[PDB]
Amino acid sequence: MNEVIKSLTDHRSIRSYTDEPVAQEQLDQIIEAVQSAPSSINGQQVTVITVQDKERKKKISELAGGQPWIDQAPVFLLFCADFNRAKIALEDLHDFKMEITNGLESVLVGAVDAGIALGTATAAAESLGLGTVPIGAVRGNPQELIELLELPKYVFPLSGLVIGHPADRSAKKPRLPQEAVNHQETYLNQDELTSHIQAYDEQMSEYMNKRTNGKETRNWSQSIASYYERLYYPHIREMLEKQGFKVEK
Amino acid sequence: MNEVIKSLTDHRSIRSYTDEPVAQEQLDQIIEAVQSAPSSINGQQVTVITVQDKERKKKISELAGGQPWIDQAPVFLLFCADFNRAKIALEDLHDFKMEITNGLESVLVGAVDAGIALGTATAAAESLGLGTVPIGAVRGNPQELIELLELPKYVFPLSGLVIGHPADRSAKKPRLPQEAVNHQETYLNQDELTSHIQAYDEQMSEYMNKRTNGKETRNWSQSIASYYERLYYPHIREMLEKQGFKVEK
Ligand SMILES: Cc1cc2nc3c(=O)[nH]c(=O)nc-3n(C[C@H](O)[C@H](O)[C@H](O)COP(=O)(O)O)c2cc1C
Ligand SMILES: Cc1cc2nc3c(=O)[nH]c(=O)nc-3n(C[C@H](O)[C@H](O)[C@H](O)COP(=O)(O)O)c2cc1C
Ligand SMILES: [Ca+2]
Ligand SMILES: [Ca+2]
Ligand SMILES: [Cl-]
Ligand SMILES: [Cl-]
């Protein structure tokens, strides 16, 4: 196993950080890695806002449901789907009307490009010895965040990424059995898939028990069910439309 | 610069492959890397279908607009957003109704998780000396692909990833100036952003010229405008709804 695979497979989110600053040089490397990754039609439909201002970062933390690690870490990166540069290219440089944003295809393009960026940044940062944790909660109060960071039309927040020096390196969290996630040739039959999930549940409860010394024993399906039983963010379509993205009829 | 950063920043898509097989051990490492990456609420909302059957892979290539490198390479991975395992967890294991899929938030969760997976797989595969190229065209004929690979309700294709041994390692393609993609504290003013795009255009035309010996000189904005002037995939919402994903009202 080479250094890259070793680094990728040793991943774990960090939520306890020291006050040590993150060198600009390291941030540059992380950004270079992000830019170097693939993107649909080389459209580079993702923008990264680097926030290091204490006051601004604190406000972001509050908008994200008040997550202390955001305030604690020296760096907060915001990954946004971006079709504004595309708008400039089509409308301003070639006097063309941009139509891709009038259908969900644009949303998928932006979200996938942003995920590639987030995953790449995570890999890069952690290879440098830095700890990270994505923040999907930025989608909880998108309008306020959009105004705070001056995100223009055709740009919308997808996920933040906390970066800093770990104060506690934590531990790896068990993942679903490989067979349940990677299927050969065709999608796995429902019965077998269910069996893998039930086995995973036992593994997860045991993990949580010894991890929390008994404070928490919830398994995986119980956790997933506690979140998805309600559409926790019912304002997504509204956010998208307000940012110039239309859902095709 | 460490090995990870060096590998990430040396990325370039490969579209010419040899007939050399991809070792199962390498595929396992790539998959382990994918599974080890972060996912929203550890929901692992992405599934990877590994296709190595010549006939099936050929059909996929045809559905993707007939891209020869898909047929040529020994491995085709399909990254799908997956809320079917979530369905099993909520409905079958806890008798709860899944509501997250009734709003676009689920679509964003799945697309971002899949992008993280795709970016991570790309990084892993290339670190092994393998060439890769994502295939967003899988979204062109989703119904046929869904039927071919037996994708159940709550699962939808986002992007394929071709993997194999390079026959031609190609070359790196210029990216937008860092300042145009990574903004400090707030989103970059429109005027400056436009200037960066125009500078990038000159860089791109020059690159294409010497790269194609003159056969092609199109710049970036011209390329982007040639694609986004129309909603090329106007059937996305339909695909999503057919797969159990609803757009909130
Ligand atoms: C989501 C996604 C979908 C893509 N779809 C295709 C495709 O269908 N066919 C193809 O040849 N390249 C595809 N690509 C590759 C891009 O064209 C390529 O990443 C971009 O031009 C940047 O060049 P590079 O990867 O060599 O650096 C895709 C990339 C991404 C991230
Ligand atoms: C898109 C996305 C959004 C996330 N949002 C948050 C968040 O708002 N707060 C948080 O503490 N963790 C967040 N996480 C981290 C997940 O909880 C974590 O990746 C998952 O539990 C797996 O644990 P691990 O990363 O330590 O391996 C997010 C991860 C992803 C990929
Ligand atoms: Ca079956
Ligand atoms: Ca401004
Ligand atoms: Cl492309
Ligand atoms: Cl989470």
Curated annotation (Swiss-Prot), chains A, B:
The EC code for this enzyme is 1.5.1.39
Q: Which GO terms describe its molecular function?
A: FMN reductase (NADH) activity; FMN reductase (NADPH) activity; FMN reductase [NAD(P)H] activity
User: What is the induction note for this entry?
Assistant: Strongly induced by stress due to exposure to 6-brom-2-vinyl-chroman-4-on (chromanon) and less strongly induced after exposure to 2-methylhydroquinone (2-MHQ) or catechol stress.
**Transcription is among the record's keywords:** no
Q: How is its activity regulated?
A: FMN is a competitive inhibitor of NADH, and therefore leads to the preferential utilization of NADPH.
Q: Which terms does the UniProt entry file under GO BP?
A: catabolic process; response to toxic substance
Listed under catalytic activity are:
FMNH2 + NADP(+) = FMN + NADPH + 2 H(+); FMNH2 + NAD(+) = FMN + NADH + 2 H(+)
Positions contributing to FMN binding: H11, R12, S13, I14, R15, Q67, P134, I135, G136, K173, P174, R175
Coiled-coil residues: none
Keywords of the record, alphabetical order, are: Aromatic hydrocarbons catabolism, Detoxification, Flavoprotein, FMN, NAD, Oxidoreductase
The record describes its quaternary structure and partners as: Homodimer.
User: Which additional comment does the entry carry?
Assistant: Catalysis proceeds by a classical ping-pong bi-bi reaction mechanism. The reduction of nitro-organic compounds and inorganic chromate occur in the absence of external FMN and are therefore believed to require binding of these substrates in the active site. In contrast to these reduction processes, azo dyes are reduced only in the presence of external FMN, indicating that azo dye reduction occurs outside the active site of the enzyme.
Protein family according to the UniProt entry = Belongs to the flavin oxidoreductase frp family.
Cite the PANTHER family for this sequence: OXYGEN-INSENSITIVE NADPH NITROREDUCTASE (PTHR43425:SF2)
What is this protein for, i.e. what is its function? Reduces FMNH(2) to FMN, with NADH or NADPH as reductant. It also reduces nitroaromatic compounds, quinones, chromates and azo dyes. It could supply the reduced form of FMN to luciferase-like protein and contribute to the degradation of aromatic compounds.
Q: What protein name is recorded for this chain?
A: FMN reductase [NAD(P)H]
